[PDB]
Design an enzyme around this catalytic site. Structure first.
Site, mmCIF file in Angstrom:
data_model
loop_
_atom_site.group_PDB
_atom_site.id
_atom_site.type_symbol
_atom_site.label_atom_id
_atom_site.label_comp_id
_atom_site.label_asym_id
_atom_site.label_seq_id
_atom_site.Cartn_x
_atom_site.Cartn_y
_atom_site.Cartn_z
ATOM 1 N N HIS F 202 -0.340 66.982 40.785
ATOM 2 C CA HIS F 202 -0.286 68.328 40.242
ATOM 3 C C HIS F 202 0.046 69.386 41.277
ATOM 4 N N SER F 206 5.917 66.559 38.892
ATOM 5 C CA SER F 206 6.649 65.318 38.755
ATOM 6 C C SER F 206 8.035 65.459 39.360
ATOM 7 N N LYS F 228 6.775 63.465 22.965
ATOM 8 C CA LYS F 228 7.584 62.426 23.582
ATOM 9 C C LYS F 228 6.727 61.283 24.089
ATOM 10 N N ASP F 229 5.505 61.571 24.525
ATOM 11 C CA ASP F 229 4.560 60.517 24.853
ATOM 12 C C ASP F 229 3.982 59.854 23.619
ATOM 13 N N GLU F 272 -3.423 33.666 36.250
ATOM 14 C CA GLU F 272 -2.679 34.277 35.140
ATOM 15 C C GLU F 272 -1.449 34.948 35.625
HETATM 16 C C1 HEM Z 1 -4.441 53.166 36.231
HETATM 17 C C2 HEM Z 1 -3.217 53.310 36.747
HETATM 18 C C3 HEM Z 1 -2.377 54.607 36.779
HETATM 19 C C4 HEM Z 1 -2.451 55.747 36.082
HETATM 20 C C5 HEM Z 1 -3.379 56.199 34.939
HETATM 21 C C6 HEM Z 1 -1.418 56.610 36.558
HETATM 22 C C7 HEM Z 1 -1.185 57.856 36.073
HETATM 23 C C8 HEM Z 1 -0.058 58.562 36.347
HETATM 24 C C9 HEM Z 1 0.455 59.633 35.545
HETATM 25 C C10 HEM Z 1 -0.186 60.159 34.251
HETATM 26 C C11 HEM Z 1 1.561 60.069 36.124
HETATM 27 C C12 HEM Z 1 2.454 61.204 35.609
HETATM 28 C C13 HEM Z 1 3.459 60.611 34.636
HETATM 29 C C14 HEM Z 1 4.636 60.132 35.426
HETATM 30 O O1 HEM Z 1 4.998 60.828 36.403
HETATM 31 O O2 HEM Z 1 5.196 59.059 35.097
HETATM 32 C C15 HEM Z 1 1.778 59.283 37.312
HETATM 33 C C16 HEM Z 1 2.806 59.420 38.192
HETATM 34 C C17 HEM Z 1 3.002 58.618 39.277
HETATM 35 N N1 HEM Z 1 2.330 57.455 39.554
HETATM 36 FE FE1 HEM Z 1 0.838 56.679 38.457
HETATM 37 N N2 HEM Z 1 -0.725 55.992 37.558
HETATM 38 C C18 HEM Z 1 -1.296 54.758 37.716
HETATM 39 C C19 HEM Z 1 -0.898 53.819 38.620
HETATM 40 C C20 HEM Z 1 0.041 54.031 39.586
HETATM 41 C C21 HEM Z 1 0.427 53.075 40.583
HETATM 42 C C22 HEM Z 1 -0.198 51.671 40.614
HETATM 43 C C23 HEM Z 1 1.374 53.630 41.344
HETATM 44 C C24 HEM Z 1 2.172 53.138 42.572
HETATM 45 C C25 HEM Z 1 1.857 52.111 43.368
HETATM 46 C C26 HEM Z 1 1.568 54.957 40.848
HETATM 47 C C27 HEM Z 1 2.456 55.841 41.373
HETATM 48 C C28 HEM Z 1 2.849 56.976 40.734
HETATM 49 C C29 HEM Z 1 3.874 57.869 41.192
HETATM 50 C C30 HEM Z 1 4.702 57.706 42.472
HETATM 51 C C31 HEM Z 1 3.963 58.853 40.320
HETATM 52 C C32 HEM Z 1 4.916 60.049 40.391
HETATM 53 C C33 HEM Z 1 6.220 59.696 39.717
HETATM 54 C C34 HEM Z 1 6.995 60.963 39.640
HETATM 55 O O3 HEM Z 1 6.384 61.998 39.305
HETATM 56 O O4 HEM Z 1 8.213 60.921 39.903
HETATM 57 N N3 HEM Z 1 0.753 55.183 39.771
HETATM 58 N N4 HEM Z 1 0.768 58.362 37.423
HETATM 59 C C1 LIG Z 2 0.415 64.953 34.453
HETATM 60 O O1 LIG Z 2 0.239 65.218 33.064
HETATM 61 C C2 LIG Z 2 -0.588 64.289 32.512
HETATM 62 C C3 LIG Z 2 -1.960 64.495 32.490
HETATM 63 O O2 LIG Z 2 -2.483 65.622 33.037
HETATM 64 C C4 LIG Z 2 -2.811 63.566 31.920
HETATM 65 C C5 LIG Z 2 -4.295 63.834 31.928
HETATM 66 C C6 LIG Z 2 -2.287 62.414 31.366
HETATM 67 C C7 LIG Z 2 -3.133 61.354 30.714
HETATM 68 C C8 LIG Z 2 -3.731 60.348 31.665
HETATM 69 C C9 LIG Z 2 -4.963 59.935 31.469
HETATM 70 C C10 LIG Z 2 -5.787 60.440 30.308
HETATM 71 C C11 LIG Z 2 -5.581 58.933 32.406
HETATM 72 C C12 LIG Z 2 -7.038 59.304 32.689
HETATM 73 C C13 LIG Z 2 -7.966 58.239 32.162
HETATM 74 C C14 LIG Z 2 -9.267 58.406 32.165
HETATM 75 C C15 LIG Z 2 -9.891 59.671 32.704
HETATM 76 C C16 LIG Z 2 -10.148 57.311 31.619
HETATM 77 C C17 LIG Z 2 -11.308 57.928 30.841
HETATM 78 C C18 LIG Z 2 -12.027 56.883 30.032
HETATM 79 C C19 LIG Z 2 -13.322 56.703 30.136
HETATM 80 C C20 LIG Z 2 -14.172 57.519 31.078
HETATM 81 C C21 LIG Z 2 -13.984 55.644 29.301
HETATM 82 C C22 LIG Z 2 -14.255 56.145 27.887
HETATM 83 C C23 LIG Z 2 -15.739 56.073 27.617
HETATM 84 C C24 LIG Z 2 -16.279 56.674 26.582
HETATM 85 C C25 LIG Z 2 -15.433 57.467 25.615
HETATM 86 C C26 LIG Z 2 -17.764 56.586 26.345
HETATM 87 C C27 LIG Z 2 -18.038 56.267 24.875
HETATM 88 C C28 LIG Z 2 -17.787 54.800 24.668
HETATM 89 C C29 LIG Z 2 -18.628 54.010 24.047
HETATM 90 C C30 LIG Z 2 -18.241 52.563 23.929
HETATM 91 C C31 LIG Z 2 -19.939 54.505 23.475
HETATM 92 C C32 LIG Z 2 -20.443 53.578 22.363
HETATM 93 C C33 LIG Z 2 -21.843 53.955 21.953
HETATM 94 C C34 LIG Z 2 -22.176 54.199 20.707
HETATM 95 C C35 LIG Z 2 -23.597 54.573 20.383
HETATM 96 C C36 LIG Z 2 -21.166 54.125 19.592
HETATM 97 C C37 LIG Z 2 -0.932 62.219 31.371
HETATM 98 O O3 LIG Z 2 -0.467 61.078 30.812
HETATM 99 C C38 LIG Z 2 -0.067 63.145 31.938
HETATM 100 O O4 LIG Z 2 1.274 62.922 31.949
HETATM 101 C C39 LIG Z 2 1.816 63.396 30.715
HETATM 102 C C1 LIG Z 3 -1.043 63.454 27.212
HETATM 103 C C2 LIG Z 3 -2.375 62.769 27.365
HETATM 104 C C3 LIG Z 3 -3.433 63.505 26.556
HETATM 105 C C4 LIG Z 3 -4.790 62.822 26.683
HETATM 106 C C5 LIG Z 3 -5.860 63.841 27.028
HETATM 107 C C6 LIG Z 3 -7.005 63.184 27.779
HETATM 108 C C7 LIG Z 3 -7.105 63.736 29.199
HETATM 109 C C8 LIG Z 3 -7.410 65.226 29.199
HETATM 110 C C9 LIG Z 3 -7.199 65.802 30.599
HETATM 111 C C10 LIG Z 3 -8.536 66.133 31.244
HETATM 112 C C11 LIG Z 3 -8.336 66.637 32.663
HETATM 113 C C12 LIG Z 3 -7.685 65.551 33.498
HETATM 114 C C13 LIG Z 3 -7.552 65.972 34.947
HETATM 115 C C14 LIG Z 3 -8.919 66.227 35.563
HETATM 116 C C15 LIG Z 3 -8.732 66.660 36.990
HETATM 117 O O1 LIG Z 3 -7.926 66.135 37.735
HETATM 118 O O2 LIG Z 3 -9.492 67.679 37.428
HETATM 119 C C16 LIG Z 3 -10.546 67.348 38.330
HETATM 120 C C17 LIG Z 3 -10.751 68.536 39.233
HETATM 121 C C18 LIG Z 3 -9.419 68.878 39.893
HETATM 122 O O3 LIG Z 3 -9.401 70.223 40.204
HETATM 123 P P1 LIG Z 3 -7.908 70.879 40.695
HETATM 124 O O4 LIG Z 3 -7.330 71.442 39.422
HETATM 125 O O5 LIG Z 3 -7.201 69.893 41.523
HETATM 126 O O6 LIG Z 3 -8.391 72.189 41.587
HETATM 127 C C19 LIG Z 3 -8.169 73.453 41.067
HETATM 128 C C20 LIG Z 3 -9.492 74.218 41.079
HETATM 129 O O7 LIG Z 3 -9.298 75.547 40.712
HETATM 130 C C21 LIG Z 3 -10.467 73.518 40.122
HETATM 131 O O8 LIG Z 3 -11.139 72.530 40.827
HETATM 132 P P2 LIG Z 3 -12.720 72.223 40.442
HETATM 133 O O9 LIG Z 3 -12.793 72.343 38.942
HETATM 134 O O10 LIG Z 3 -13.640 72.924 41.354
HETATM 135 O O11 LIG Z 3 -12.829 70.532 40.710
HETATM 136 C C22 LIG Z 3 -13.999 69.879 40.355
HETATM 137 C C23 LIG Z 3 -14.159 68.623 41.229
HETATM 138 C C24 LIG Z 3 -15.630 68.454 41.607
HETATM 139 O O12 LIG Z 3 -15.728 67.516 42.694
HETATM 140 C C25 LIG Z 3 -16.848 67.596 43.441
HETATM 141 C C26 LIG Z 3 -16.863 66.875 44.755
HETATM 142 O O13 LIG Z 3 -17.809 68.239 43.057
#
Ligand code: HEM
Ligand SMILES: COc1c(O)c(C)c(C/C=C(\C)CC/C=C(\C)CC/C=C(\C)CC/C=C(\C)CC/C=C(/C)CCC=C(C)C)c(O)c1OC
Ligand SMILES: CCCCCCCCCCCCCCC(=O)OCCCOP(=O)(O)OC[C@@H](O)COP(=O)(O)OCCCOC(C)=O
Ligand SMILES: CCCCCCCCCCC(=O)OC[C@H](COP(=O)(O)OC[C@H](O)COP(=O)(O)OC[C@@H](COC(=O)CC)OC(=O)CCC)OC(=O)CCCCCCCC
Ligand SMILES: CCCCCCCCCCCCCCCC(=O)OC[C@H](COP(=O)([O-])OCC[N+](C)(C)C)OC(=O)CCCCCCCCCCCCCCC
Ligand SMILES: CCCCCCCCCCCCCCCCCC(=O)OC[C@H](COP(=O)(O)OCCN)OC(=O)CCCCCCCCCCCCC
Ligand code: HEM
Ligand code: HEM
Ligand SMILES: CCCCCCCCCCCCCCC(=O)O[C@H](COC(=O)CCCCCCCCCCCC)COP(=O)(O)O
Ligand SMILES: CCCCCCCCCCCCCCCCCC(=O)O[C@H](COC(=O)CCCCCC)COP(=O)(O)OCCN
Ligand SMILES: CCCCCCCCCCCCCCCCCC(=O)O[C@H](COC(=O)CCCCCC)COP(=O)(O)OCCN
Ligand SMILES: CCCCCCCCCCCCCC(=O)O[C@H](COC(=O)CCCCCCCCCCC)COP(=O)(O)O
Lengths: 54, 248, 75, 62, 93, 385
Positions: F202, F206, F228-229, F272
């Site tokens: 961020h 990108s 688009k996503d 696997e």
């Molecule tokens: C749990 C696994 C991962 C999550 C949730 C994740 C999430 C994301 C997301 C949401 C973006 C922005 C969308 C995009 O730019 O395509 C991103 C960008 C990127 N990710 Fe991942 N990522 C994962 C794993 C990885 C891994 C394994 C790598 C590389 C070894 C990686 C490298 C990058 C890079 C280089 C970008 C920037 C691409 C660009 O903006 O041109 N990410 N990632």
């Molecule tokens: C840069 O712009 C972005 C962007 O900002 C984001 C956020 C995303 C989206 C990426 C993500 C959301 C990845 C982040 C993933 C997580 C933070 C994982 C979060 C998941 C968990 C913490 C686990 C979920 C757990 C629960 C919901 C708890 C409840 C679950 C259960 C099983 C409770 C059951 C109990 C009862 C009583 C029913 C993008 O794809 C993206 O590019 C468009």
């Molecule tokens: C398209 C997909 C849709 C799916 C939707 C599901 C996902 C929804 C998105 C939820 C938010 C995801 C990103 C969360 C995140 O990265 O923020 C964490 C804090 C980052 O803060 P910053 O903006 O980098 O700093 C910018 C600052 O102004 C805010 O920073 P501050 O708030 O102070 O940070 C808190 C960190 C605390 O850490 C500790 C050590 O205490």
């Protein structure tokens, strides 16, 4: 037409038509896909094998 | 590995439950439990199949309450702590023929016969192999092959030498519904039945998939349209550039 | 009255133009092996020729012609 | 070319706008995607919620 | 709050690109144009144009490696046969 | 101001998924980031609902997986979503690190994004290996043996880490019980490393498939890249729903339904598929110490890539020679998966040594030479003198 005013204008009645249109889609599409799946497999199900035990 | 040490490739038979919209033949499982009981219940446990799962799949409710009351399981002990037995019920598993592993090895010349609950999912080929194993025994093995004393030959087993002897012979069972019990008819029926025992959801896994592929591919053609709808202001943008006054 | 359905087809496919040409290879091995395994000093040999390769050729031609032809005959 | 002469958008424009229709050939296909995503998110919740209920071998001992 | 370092992306208004001038952009509302007006003549005629350019980089790196795999997987089944056991006993030895 | 920018929590939702300025020209390969976020939630929501039925002792490990698939209501849905939704984790992730290699998204200023990429890639190889070992099949027991016997090659501290991992003398009840409580944990380290992965993204935004600046023509995230996503969410949920309902045991191994027996070795002892190209690297070094290092340096050679890419334009889009040699590498990673699933026989013991050299000469020879010949050919093609 005037279809927009009654259905799509107020969002409270737009999304109330999505949920009342999904309550009919659940009951009908499930029965329509069960009654096809057993009719395609007529003669293999237990309801037919229980009829051969006469 | 040599082709002999790999096993022959079990071919592709035309099973009645292949394909995506087909289910099991529930008159070939009911005829396939009878071949399990009368032939391989002697030396093959089925220890993961409860008696209740046979109800409604290939037997009625009274045909299983008169098939589980033939065996005997361990009741809770009496008011003096002596152990006692009880006839079985619908909540018990199908009892294996051997009490422990060493009793199983002693009766089959060292070879432990595997439990047939998941034997079609745990073999390379699935039911195409379990069928072709049972009918794959030659009358005499090929020349030059020295079999150890007490090991039978069939090519579909990996290695060539198997410990199970050729067991399915013609008309050794008599089916209830008047079916010609040949070697291939019996081997098809257990292989459907052992396919059921490892996949009791196969009737309903394939019809929940019909609900899901119909919804999640008419939710994908719709989401293509709403992407093309909302991006129509960007995909038909027009830029014109006339360069500004250079005096600035 | 009714015999086995699968050995009705294997004897049907071991008499065609290709089935007869492959059992002639298995008969050219299992005759060579028998006059080899009657030779003196056979048990103390570094390797013995077997007919598993010729048998695997014949058993692969048969079960690929009776793979889709069988299950309609089985009730 | 001036900035008061807009370029040729004629190959993509509709032949009749009629904003009661164009906002109904587009709220149908948004409402249809919402309908299957409410019949598709019932089943996703009901899969996981009914997984926690009384299992098969517990029901046999009732 | 606290400051941060220099980046190469700002926000809406101070994005940090070069100053642009004399570039004007027209766009029509998507309620006023037909979406998917050109699904045909693009799935046929444009999708061939994309495939004509970027296929010779995904066929020769898959023609070098698949000919290499099929020339070894066929070689493996030669020396594990009855015909190639005399070549096997000199390669592993 | 608006409430979506004035609230303390909604300003993080606004600046990330609603008003985040994405470049307008990014193609469908940028949807793999949102797919991995969806595919992580599927491995967690169907993990909690599957760990309410899983007993972790070695006598009740494999028998409780069969308790899930036969007794629990929709247990066949829950397990097959978890075993095939983990193969789909490593197929989106392999198409996410190949978009990164291709479009030059490792270069500056995004090196601190690539480095947290390789950390998340390590903790997911670790999680998919611990979770495979919780089923205790014949490929799951004997997979844990061959992997954790590799740490007995560390000099002079060898046998005391292996006998600390095992909790005993072989893979036993102390091991599977600790391979479950560790495997439950690490997806809450990945889910807190992804938040450390969106933060490094961020600050610079990108990239885009041209490799030029995107600060000129930006469009917001909401109502443009949300929908688009949503095209590839409903496509990912469609190719999953064929591999869960219609062919669920295609990606898995058949031997994993044999219960874990430590007294019989299987015929081919193979992890696997996705860990296969890191298994033909390990198995190609004819030594035990170097084989562990070369397998661990096959992930840590991804860090030398910002410093070995000598091209002055970003990404392979407008380059001819460094676009051919990319797909030479991509169809070398596939061959290296196939050598890892074949037996240790001639000529696969030589194929796996050439195709390991090509994996380690792409990042260190082929990239810093082709991306130097291209920098000269761009110059002398235009500058006449
Ligand atoms: C749990 C696994 C991962 C999550 C949730 C994740 C999430 C994301 C997301 C949401 C973006 C922005 C969308 C995009 O730019 O395509 C991103 C960008 C990127 N990710 Fe991942 N990522 C994962 C794993 C990885 C891994 C394994 C790598 C590389 C070894 C990686 C490298 C990058 C890079 C280089 C970008 C920037 C691409 C660009 O903006 O041109 N990410 N990632
Ligand atoms: C840069 O712009 C972005 C962007 O900002 C984001 C956020 C995303 C989206 C990426 C993500 C959301 C990845 C982040 C993933 C997580 C933070 C994982 C979060 C998941 C968990 C913490 C686990 C979920 C757990 C629960 C919901 C708890 C409840 C679950 C259960 C099983 C409770 C059951 C109990 C009862 C009583 C029913 C993008 O794809 C993206 O590019 C468009
Ligand atoms: C398209 C997909 C849709 C799916 C939707 C599901 C996902 C929804 C998105 C939820 C938010 C995801 C990103 C969360 C995140 O990265 O923020 C964490 C804090 C980052 O803060 P910053 O903006 O980098 O700093 C910018 C600052 O102004 C805010 O920073 P501050 O708030 O102070 O940070 C808190 C960190 C605390 O850490 C500790 C050590 O205490
Ligand atoms: C196995 C496990 C997979 C699990 C992940 C599931 C998701 C996989 C996604 C793979 C992928 O992202 O590839 C995207 C690829 C490149 O996209 P692009 O931006 O360069 O093309 C612009 C397009 O016209 C947009 O066209 P538009 O956006 O206007 O239409 C929507 C389009 C959506 O298509 C897709 O999402 C990809 C299938 O609708 C259709 O045309 C489908 C008609 C049936 O799309 C293409 O168009 C193909 C080009 C060649 C790539 C071959 C891919 C082989 C791996
Ligand atoms: C997540 C998985 C579960 C999905 C459940 C979806 C529940 C049904 C909601 C879908 C729906 O009907 O959306 C319609 C509304 C409005 O969405 P819209 O049609 O773009 O807004 C137009 C407003 N008018 C002009 C009609 C007044 O949309 C909304 O109010 C937004 C709801 C978004 C929910 C996510
Ligand atoms: C540990 C390290 C991990 C490394 C990962 C190893 C590789 C994993 C395999 C992932 C496959 C991903 C393929 C690469 C995807 C990113 C590259 C790409 O997006 O392709 C775009 C390319 C040309 O597109 P342009 O961007 O140049 O268009 C602008 C035109 N002016 O378009 C093309 O040229 C065609 C794209 C065709 C993709 C072919 C994919 C092959 C998949 C393997 C098949 C295996 C079975 C044979
Ligand atoms: C319809 C009848 C039968 C069926 C379907 C059946 C099924 C099987 C199967 C699938 C195997 C596994 C082969 C493999 O692992 O590749 C096997 C092995 C074995 N069977 Fe049978 N069986 C039957 C009858 C019998 C009988 C009556 C005996 C009685 C002694 C027997 C004894 C064995 C033994 C000892 C093995 C182990 C062989 C080995 O591990 O080498 N089987 N059986
Ligand atoms: C990124 C996250 C994850 C990945 C890649 C992953 C992957 C896997 C894999 C490959 C298996 C083996 C399945 C099989 O072959 O049978 C497995 C098993 C398992 N996983 Fe996960 N997993 C993840 C997260 C989780 C989480 C958060 C839980 C939470 C409890 C969990 C619970 C289980 C359980 C209980 C098993 C054993 C039962 C079974 O195999 O179905 N997993 N996991
Ligand atoms: C943590 C999990 C990460 C997974 C990544 C998911 C990325 C895509 C999420 C899309 C959310 C759609 C919200 C659109 C919206 O609010 O627009 C709202 C209204 O849009 C709609 O009504 C769309 C119809 C409802 C679609 C329901 C889709 C549910 C399927 C979800 C599958 C993924 C969970 C505002 O739209 P507007 O600004 O154009 O007026
Ligand atoms: C995985 C999390 C890791 C860290 C990432 C943080 C991202 C969090 C995103 C959460 C999005 C949903 C939050 C919506 C809450 C907005 C309501 C609000 O802020 O109003 C707050 C009150 O909030 C509450 O009472 C309960 C908040 C609990 C939230 C539990 C989820 C009041 O708002 P206001 O700023 O106008 O305060 C006026 C002072 N009198
Ligand atoms: C829910 C959020 C959970 C909490 C997350 C936020 C709080 C996390 C606190 C982390 C403190 C420890 C991080 C110190 C690392 C700083 C070094 C650094 O940033 O150098 C980065 C490179 O980072 C890496 O390569 C890997 C970092 C992975 C971190 C894994 C823990 C380079 O930094 P920079 O781009 O400013 O270089 C200037 C050139 N002289
Ligand atoms: C929360 C993580 C779950 C993600 C699931 C994605 C994997 C796709 C396969 C899903 C199959 C499981 C459901 C099922 O078997 O239903 C089957 C029907 O198929 C569907 O409806 C699939 C629609 C999926 C819509 C996706 C929206 C997700 C919203 C999540 C909000 C919490 C069976 O339904 P039934 O039990 O007969 O009522």
């Amino acid at each position: 037409s005037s279809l927009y005013k009654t259905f799509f204008k107020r969002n409270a009645v737009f999304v109330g038509t999505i949920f009342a249109g999904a309550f009919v889609f659940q009951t009908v599409f499930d029965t329509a896909i069960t009654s096809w799946y057993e009719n395609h497999n007529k003669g293999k199900l237990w309801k037919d094998v229980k009829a051969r035990i006469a | 590995m040599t082709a002999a040490e790999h096993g022959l490739h079990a071919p592709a038979y035309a099973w009645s439950h292949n394909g995506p919209f087909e289910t099991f033949d529930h008159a070939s499982i009911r005829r396939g439990y009878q071949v399990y009981r009368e032939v391989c219940a002697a030396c093959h446990s089925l220890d993961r199949v409860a008696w209740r799962t046979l109800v409604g799949v290939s037997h009625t409710n009274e045909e299983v309450r008169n098939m589980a009351e033939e065996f005997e399981y361990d009741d809770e002990p009496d008011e003096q702590g002596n152990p006692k037995k009880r006839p079985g019920k619908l909540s018990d598993y199908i009892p294996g023929p051997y009490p422990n592993e060493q009793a199983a090895r002693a009766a089959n010349q060292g070879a432990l016969p595997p439990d047939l609950s998941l034997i079609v999912k745990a073999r390379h080929g699935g039911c195409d192999y379990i069928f072709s194993l049972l009918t794959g025994y030659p009358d005499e093995p090929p020349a030059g092959v020295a079999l150890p004393p007490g090991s039978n030959y069939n090519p579909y087993f990996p290695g060539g030498s198997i410990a199970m002897a050729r067991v399915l012979f013609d008309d050794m069972v008599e089916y209830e519904d008047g079916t010609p019990a040949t070697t291939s008819q019996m081997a098809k029926d257990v292989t459907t039945f052992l396919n059921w025992c490892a996949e009791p959801e196969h009737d309903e896994r394939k019809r929940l998939g019909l609900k899901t592929v119909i919804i999640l591919s008419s939710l994908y053609l719709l989401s293509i349209w709403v992407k093309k709808f909302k991006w129509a202001g960007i995909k038909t943008r027009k830029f014109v550039f006339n360069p500004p006054k250079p005096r600035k | 009255e009714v015999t086995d359905q699968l050995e009705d087809l294997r004897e049907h496919f071991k008499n065609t133009e290709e089935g007869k040409a492959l059992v002639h290879h298995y008969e050219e091995c299992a005759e060579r092996v028998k006059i080899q395994q009657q030779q003196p000093g056979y048990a103390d040999l570094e390797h013995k020729e077997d007919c598993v390769e010729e048998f695997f050729h014949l058993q692969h031609y048969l079960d690929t012609a009776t793979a889709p032809r069988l299950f309609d005959k089985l009730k | 070319k001036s900035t008061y002469r807009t370029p040729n958008f004629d190959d993509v424009l509709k032949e009749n706008n009629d904003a009661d229709k164009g906002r109904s050939y587009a709220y149908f296909m948004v409402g249809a995607m919402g309908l299957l995503s409410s019949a598709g998110a019932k089943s996703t919740v009901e899969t996981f919620i009914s997984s926690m209920t009384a299992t098969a071998d517990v029901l046999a001992m009732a | 709050g606290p400051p941060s370092g220099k980046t190469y992306m700002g926000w809406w208004g101070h994005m940090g690109g070069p100053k642009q001038k004399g570039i004007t952009s027209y766009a029509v509302s998507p309620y006023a144009q037909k979406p998917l007006q050109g699904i045909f003549h693009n799935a046929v005629f444009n999708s061939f144009r994309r495939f004509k350019s970027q296929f010779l980089y995904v066929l020769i790196p898959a023609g070098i490696y698949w000919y290499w795999w099929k020339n070894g997987n066929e070689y493996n089944e030669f020396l594990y046969s009855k015909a190639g056991r005399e070549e096997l006993e000199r390669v592993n030895v | 101001m608006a409430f979506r920018k004035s609230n303390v929590y909604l300003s993080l939702v606004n600046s990330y998924i609603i008003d985040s300025p994405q470049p307008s020209s990014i193609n469908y390969w940028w949807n793999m980031g949102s797919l991995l976020g969806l595919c992580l939630v599927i491995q967690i929501v169907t993990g909690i609902f599957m760990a309410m039925h899983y007993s972790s002792n070695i006598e009740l490990a494999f028998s409780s997986v069969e308790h899930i698939m036969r007794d629990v209501h929709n247990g066949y849905i829950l397990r097959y979503l978890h075993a095939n939704g983990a193969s789909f984790f490593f197929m989106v992730m392999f198409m996410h690190m190949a978009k990164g290699l291709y479009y030059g998204s490792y270069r500056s200023p995004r090196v601190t994004l690539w480095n947290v990429g390789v950390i998340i890639f390590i903790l997911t190889i670790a999680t998919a290996f611990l979770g495979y070992c919780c089923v205790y099949g014949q490929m799951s027991h004997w997979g844990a043996t061959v992997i954790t016997n590799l740490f007995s090659a560390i000099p002079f501290v060898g046998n005391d880490i292996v006998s600390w991992l095992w909790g005993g003398f072989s893979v036993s009840n102390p091991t599977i019980q600790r391979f479950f409580a560790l495997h439950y944990l690490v997806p809450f380290i990945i889910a807190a490393m992804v938040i450390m992965h969106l933060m490094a993204l961020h600050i610079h935004g990108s990239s885009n498939p041209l490799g030029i600046t995107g600060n000129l023509d930006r469009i917001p995230m909401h109502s443009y890249f949300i929908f688009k996503d949503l095209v590839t969410v409903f496509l990912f949920m469609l190719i999953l729903a064929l591999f869960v309902f219609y062919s669920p045991n295609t990606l898995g191994h058949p031997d994993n339904y044999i219960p874990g027996n430590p007294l019989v070795t299987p015929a081919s002892i193979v992890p696997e598929w996705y860990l296969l190209p890191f298994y033909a690297i390990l198995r190609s070094i004819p030594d035990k110490l170097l084989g562990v290092i070369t397998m661990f340096a096959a992930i840590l050679v991804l860090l030398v890539l910002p410093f070995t890419d000598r091209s002055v334009v970003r990404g392979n889009t407008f380059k001819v020679l460094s676009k051919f040699f990319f797909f030479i590498f991509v169809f070398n990673f596939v061959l290296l998966g196939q050598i890892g699933a074949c037996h240790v026989e001639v000529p696969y013991v030589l194929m796996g040594q050439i195709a390991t050299f090509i994996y380690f000469a792409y990042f260190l020879i082929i990239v810093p030479v082709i991306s130097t010949i291209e920098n000269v050919l761009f110059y002398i093609g235009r500058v006449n003198k």
